Amino acid sequence: ESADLRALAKHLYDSYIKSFPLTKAKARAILTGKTTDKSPFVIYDMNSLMMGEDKIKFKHIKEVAIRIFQGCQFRSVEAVQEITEYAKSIPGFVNLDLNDQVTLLKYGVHEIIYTMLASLMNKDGVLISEGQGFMTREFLKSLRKPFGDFMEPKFEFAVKFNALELDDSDLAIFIAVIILSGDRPGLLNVKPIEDIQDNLLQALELQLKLNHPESSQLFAKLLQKMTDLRQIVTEHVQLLQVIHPLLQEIYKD
Amino acid sequence: ESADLRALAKHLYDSYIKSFPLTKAKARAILTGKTTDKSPFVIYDMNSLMMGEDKEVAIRIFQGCQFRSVEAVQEITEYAKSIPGFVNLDLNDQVTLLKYGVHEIIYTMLASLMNKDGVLISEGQGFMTREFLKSLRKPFGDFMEPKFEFAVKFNALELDDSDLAIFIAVIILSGDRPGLLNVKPIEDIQDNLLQALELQLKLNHPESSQLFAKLLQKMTDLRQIVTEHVQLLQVIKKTETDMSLHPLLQEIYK
Numbered sequence: 375e376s377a378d379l380r381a382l383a384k385h386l387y388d389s390y391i392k393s394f395p396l397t398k399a400k401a402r403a404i405l406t407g408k409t410t411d412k413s414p415f416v417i418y419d420m421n422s423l424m425m426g427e428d429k430i431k432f433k434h435i436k437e438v439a440i441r442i443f444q445g446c447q448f449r450s451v452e453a454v455q456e457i458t459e460y461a462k463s464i465p466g467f468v469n470l471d472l473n474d475q476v477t478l479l480k481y482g483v484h485e486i487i488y489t490m491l492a493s494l495m496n497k498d499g500v501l502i503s504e505g506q507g508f509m510t511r512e513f514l515k516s517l518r519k520p521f522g523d524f525m526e527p528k529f530e531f532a533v534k535f536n537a538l539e540l541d542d543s544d545l546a547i548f549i550a551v552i553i554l555s556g557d558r559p560g561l562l563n564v565k566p567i568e569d570i571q572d573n574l575l576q577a578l579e580l581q582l583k584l585n586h587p588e589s590s591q592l593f594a595k596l597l598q599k600m601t602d603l604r605q606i607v608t609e610h611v612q613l614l615q616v617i618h619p620l621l622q623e624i625y626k627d
Numbered sequence: 628e629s630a631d632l633r634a635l636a637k638h639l640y641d642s643y644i645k646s647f648p649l650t651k652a653k654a655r656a657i658l659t660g661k662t663t664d665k666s667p668f669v670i671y672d673m674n675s676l677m678m679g680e681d682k683e684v685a686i687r688i689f690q691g692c693q694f695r696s697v698e699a700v701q702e703i704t705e706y707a708k709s710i711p712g713f714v715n716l717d718l719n720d721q722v723t724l725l726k727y728g729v730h731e732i733i734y735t736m737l738a739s740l741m742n743k744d745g746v747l748i749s750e751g752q753g754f755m756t757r758e759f760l761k762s763l764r765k766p767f768g769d770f771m772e773p774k775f776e777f778a779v780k781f782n783a784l785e786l787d788d789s790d791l792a793i794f795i796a797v798i799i800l801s802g803d804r805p806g807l808l809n810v811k812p813i814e815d816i817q818d819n820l821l822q823a824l825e826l827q828l829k830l831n832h833p834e835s836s837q838l839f840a841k842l843l844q845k846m847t848d849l850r851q852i853v854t855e856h857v858q859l860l861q862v863i864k865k866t867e868t869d870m871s872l873h874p875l876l877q878e879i880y881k
């Protein structure tokens with residue numbers, strides 16, 4: 375069957391490219407400065423932040439630590455819609471019961487946000503506003519009582535995750551696997567979900583063998599990173615359990 | 628290399644048998660009423676508990692289960708030493724691997740002693756119903772339920788002891804443990820255990836698609852039980868100040 379697996383891999387990669395404007399390949403070029411096109415504007419302290427809001431557009435703009443957290447919310451809501459559009463390209467996804475489609479996205483978007491956030495991170499900071507900015511890890515830590523410990527665990531995961539050296543080709547299938555997980559609560563029909571994931575795990579396995587022939591247990595290592603993601607999502611919602619009515623409706627989650 | 632991985636699978640299954648007196652194959656023969664094994668006495672209420680026993684009830688049961696974790700930990704420690712490379716790791720790492728790995732292992736193997744209706748006790752001589760455990764006093768009525776919800780799901784994989792042997796080995800040799808000094812040697816070992824396991828699942832479960840994937844995905848549930856379990860011990864400590872914890876169990880819960 376090792377050809378419709380490579381076809382499912384090529385399909386997914388193509389959607390991923392259409393759905394996510396800033397790809398890892400692209401994000402990598404900006405972060406390593408390997409492409410010396412334009413440097414991102416760097417936010418490394420309070421004065422550069424304030425200058426950054428003058429230069430960079432920012433669609434979400436009172437208080438600084440709050441303002442940064444809300445910007446992250448805006449972007450997260452944006453990510454949710456990119457992921458939802460991608461989920462629809464996954465073969466068989468749209469044929470699932472509508473409630474299950476909603477359930478799979480509801481519990482899955484967070485894990486995928488972190489996965490793709492790792493694509494925009496290094497040990498020193500995170501690319502923001504479509505790669506136009508770069509917010510340092512040290513500037514984020516230097517934030518208030520609850521807010522300075524909000525991005526750190528993402529950076530810690532990213533450093534780990536990024537050491538697998540996956541590319542967009544690999545990430546495209548990996549994200550599809552996350553979405554099609556039949557253990558989400560309240561699913562009504564788990565069978566066709568487990569079926570599609572079985573098919574996606576099979577394509578992810580062959581992809582990793584062909585694309586990373588020298589790292590034998592990369593598949594396993596990647597699967598055990600999925601459990602890492604569930605952990606980070608848990609302690610994050612628990613952090614959102616400390617932190618205008620219409621806006622609080624847009625950001626219900 | 629295939630032959631090398633098969634040899635490793637054989638080695639670990641062999642040490643598992645020598646280390647764990649109550650195997651899943653034994654537990655299944657007791658639970659499903661075979662003729663290789665005897666039938667357990669069933670504890671389903673305070674009456675059965677009393678006639679079965681051959682300071683309050685919930686505390687007696689909880690402490691009983693606590694003493695069984697101590698035996699498990701001893702068995703687990705004995706089995707780890709047989710995993711090739713484990714005893715050659717830095718001693719501090721050995722302790723860390725055991726400290727964190729042991730609870731995930733206890734709950735994995737405890738699934739072998741469980742069905743949806745209860746769990747085997749006293750080396751399989753007894754069987755305590757899920758409901759008798761679910762009806763215990765306010766904090767102690769909660770302690771077994773996450774393990775049952777896990778067991779029901781974990782058991783649906785239909786793993787046998789030769790699979791579990793390698794999977795337990797993978798659990799112990801995790802380089803994600805807090806405070807590990809040399810992550811690399813641990814990961815090289817795990818890479819090989821993972822290869823062996825992968826081969827084992829393909830060979831032993833040839834009809835069962837992505838069992839390797841599906842089994843590694845079972846770590847999330849293991850982490851959740853552990854987290855919820857240590858939270859419950861914090862509660863027990865504050866409300867039951869006269870109640871004890873075993874030195875070995877003190878060491879681990881940190």
Ligand SMILES: O=C(Nc1ccc(Oc2ncccn2)cc1C(=O)O)c1ccc(Cl)cc1Cl
Pocket residue numbers: 417423426427432441442443444445446447449450453487490491494500501502503504509
């Ligand atoms: O953390 C994220 N984004 C931001 C967080 C804070 C922020 O806040 C901010 N920065 C500078 C000045 C004011 N506010 C802006 C963004 C962004 O992407 O633009 C983020 C969230 C999810 C995803 Cl998928 C990607 C990113 Cl880059």
